[PDB]
């Protein structure tokens, strides 16, 4: 279902953004074991966007592993100009997101994980709402799947078999 | 109210000498206080947006309520919000006087405007926040055309090279052609950060 993309050696414009840092714990007989998990979103300011989770014992190592995983896992999103073709709602775990296209001079009306995802994908005119949990993993995944479920008018006409649906 | 504090502190804090040219900015490029030039602790994106807003405010001599109202005006107006905000900031009467070169600094222009040495369309206007429109004429008052400070400031300002300002030395006046584009405005303020800070 996802468009997917090979390692973008040519499309090396992938800027990496950090969503959240967490210090998870594991218990053993000796004591407690501490690690670090980072959520990293790589984007080329175009429909290409990837997400990754990097786990390590140190923050730079976790961020690097997240960058690597995000680079490995890439998809393409059908974005026209700085907006989205239509509205779209998505759910992933306890997180629910809703995106609506806005006017050209509106900016991005979102904050946090959704704002990071939208910046990485290169959408600059959208109203975004979160109606579920604020979990970073689920918010990032729900926003990405909302973007992936979109369809431009050309694709709509293509799978409908017609040319102009009075658009 | 006015800032009326030391200026080299703000110049050193922001790096750019926004108040003109000074001999202090060299050999001293640290924010004021005993904790200056001790590396640079990671400032957040919110801190950077705040520092950009403060840079604009200290540059144009505008307090926070007036700045917020200017942002509201730019948002209501048609065009790019940041470009409109910078145009509105540059369209103030004291800034227009400073760009015309009647006074050396923006604060000097504000003092002249307040002390009523500036006429707009032949009438004395003394509100420094007065919004100058294109087509208007801003000139020295006839009773103060021989001020030593004004004469010194105009001495060496034979350039008057600003494209959106037409200077007439015979009448000791000037006119505004149009609102300049943000790229034409010579200010290092990143209006995008201020826009997102004020809209979020």
């Amino acid at each position: 279902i996802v468009y997917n993309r090979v390692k973008s050696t040519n499309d090396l414009e992938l800027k990496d953004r950090l969503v959240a840092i967490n210090r998870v714990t594991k218990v053993t007989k000796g004591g407690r074991t501490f690690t670090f998990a980072a959520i990293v979103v790589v984007g080329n300011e175009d429909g290409v966007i990837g997400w990754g989770l990097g786990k390590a014992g140190e923050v730079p190592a976790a961020i690097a592993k997240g960058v690597e995983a995000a680079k490995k896992n890439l998809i393409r999103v059908p974005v026209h100009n700085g907006t989205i073709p239509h509205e779209q709602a998505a759910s992933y775990g306890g997180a629910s997101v809703f995106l609506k296209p806005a006017t050209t001079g509106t900016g991005v009306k979102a904050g946090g994980a959704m704002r990071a995802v939208l910046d990485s994908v290169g959408v600059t005119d959208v109203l975004a709402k979160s109606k579920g949990s604020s979990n970073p993993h689920n918010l990032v995944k729900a926003t990405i799947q909302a973007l992936a479920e979109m369809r431009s008018p050309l694709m709509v006409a293509q799978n409908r078999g017609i040319s102009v649906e009075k658009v | 109210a006015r800032y009326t504090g030391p200026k080299s502190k703000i110049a050193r804090k922001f790096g750019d000498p926004i108040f003109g040219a000074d001999k202090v900015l060299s050999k001293k490029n640290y924010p004021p206080g005993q904790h200056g030039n001790n590396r640079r602790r990671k400032t957040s994106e919110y801190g950077l947006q705040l520092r950009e807003k403060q840079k604009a405010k200290y540059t144009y001599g505008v307090l926070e309520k007036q700045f917020r109202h200017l942002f509201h005006r730019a948002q209501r107006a048609k065009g790019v919000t940041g470009e409109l905000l910078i145009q509105f900031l540059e369209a103030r009467l004291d800034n227009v006087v400073f760009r015309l070169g009647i006074a050396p600094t923006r604060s000097a222009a504000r003092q002249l405007v307040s002390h009523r040495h500036i006429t707009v369309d032949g009438s004395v206007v003394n509100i420094p926040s007065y919004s100058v429109k294109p087509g208007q004429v801003i000139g020295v008052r006839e009773r103060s055309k021989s001020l030593e400070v004004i004469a010194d400031a105009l001495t060496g300002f034979n350039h008057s090279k600003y494209p959106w300002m037409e200077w007439d030395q015979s009448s000791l006046s000037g006119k505004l052609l149009h609102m300049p584009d943000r790229t034409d405005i010579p200010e290092n303020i990143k209006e995008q950060l201020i826009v997102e800070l004020y809209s979020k």
């Binding site: - | 006839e142 009773r143 103060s144 055309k145 021989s146 001020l147």
Partner: protein, 118 residues
């Protein structure tokens, strides 16, 4: 009785009047039957806006104007018997030509020389 009068509607130090048709018992700035114009006495030409047809109709049905409202009506030319003429017709008063009387009186401008030779 029904009256033609002014309601004070500007602000402190700047009076702007709304010429209305109102019952005499109504409050000064309160209920009114109809609005027929406006009056700005701050401008030297003494700005007046008036609905001629409605003002004439109210005068015809018998609204009694106050002193200033009557002066405004006379200045605008509502107070006439040209319609009262039972023995003549098409009696163009043409008094608007004389009532124009454009008072373009201005003031000479003088300047003080700046002899600051120092």
């Amino acid at each position: 009785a029904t009256k033609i009068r002014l309601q004070r509607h500007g602000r402190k130090g700047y009076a702007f009047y709304k010429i209305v048709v109102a019952d005499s018992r109504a409050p000064r700035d309160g209920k009114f039957i109809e609005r027929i114009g406006s009056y700005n006495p701050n401008t030297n030409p003494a700005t007046i806006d008036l609905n001629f047809e409605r003002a004439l109709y109210w005068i015809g049905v018998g609204a009694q104007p106050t002193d200033t409202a009557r002066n405004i009506l006379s200045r605008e030319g509502v107070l006439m018997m040209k319609h009262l003429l039972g023995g003549v017709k098409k009696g163009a008063f043409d008094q608007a030509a004389a009532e124009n009387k454009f008072e373009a009186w201005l003031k000479g401008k003088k300047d003080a020389l700046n002899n600051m030779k120092a």
